Amino acid sequence: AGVKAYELRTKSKEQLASQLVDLKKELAELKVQKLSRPSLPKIKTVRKSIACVLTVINEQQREAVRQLYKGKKYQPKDLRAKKTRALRRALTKFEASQVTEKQRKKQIAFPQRKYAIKA
């Protein structure tokens, strides 16, 4: 069965810490039994739940750091995007849509007109 994440996301941080150490104690108490018994598949669920709890904690802290660095340039290299080396190095649409005044005037005066040819 295991624990669910939707019911952990409501909990605080300290509750999760206690949940976590309880679960690791339980996993120890299971790995002392696995050597006596041949089979013990319950252990997978506890491993699974530990992983879920850690994922939740990681997300809770990463979101706090996002809101901390909200509204400013220079946020960290694991919170902002990843997309690709090239696309990160490429011109923004600002930096690419930049024109000279010489060409803006010509674009406003003489743009491609919408013509049609029957009569």
Partner 1 sequence: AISKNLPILKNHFRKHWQERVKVHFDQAGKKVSRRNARATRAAKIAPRP
Partner 2 sequence: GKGTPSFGKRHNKSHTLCNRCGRRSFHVQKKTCSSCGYPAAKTRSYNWGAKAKRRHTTGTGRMRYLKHVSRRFKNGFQTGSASKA
Partner 3 sequence: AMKKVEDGNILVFQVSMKANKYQIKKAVKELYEVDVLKVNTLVRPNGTKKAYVRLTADYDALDIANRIGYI
Work out the angle between the directed axes of helices 13-31 and 42-68 (0-180°, nearest 10): 160
Residue 25: CB minimum distance to partner 3, A: 9
Residue whose entry in the numeric block shows the structure tokens 């696995």: 34
CB nearer RNA, residue 55 or residue 98 = 55
Q: Which is nearer to partner 3, 33 or 98 (CB)?
A: 33
Residue 41 half-sphere exposure, CB side, CA atoms within 13 Å? 1
**Binding residues for partner 2 (CB under 8 A):** 81, 83-84, 87
C-alpha of 62 from chain center: 8
Q: Which of partner 3, RNA, partner 1, none does 12 bind, CB closer than 5 to 8 A by kind? A: none
**Closest CB to RNA among 4 and 105?**
4
CA separation for the pair 70, 80 (Å, rounded):
11
Is residue 29 part of the contact set for partner 3 (CB under 8 A)? Answer: yes
Q: Where does this chain bind partner 1 (CB under 8 A)?
A: 114-117
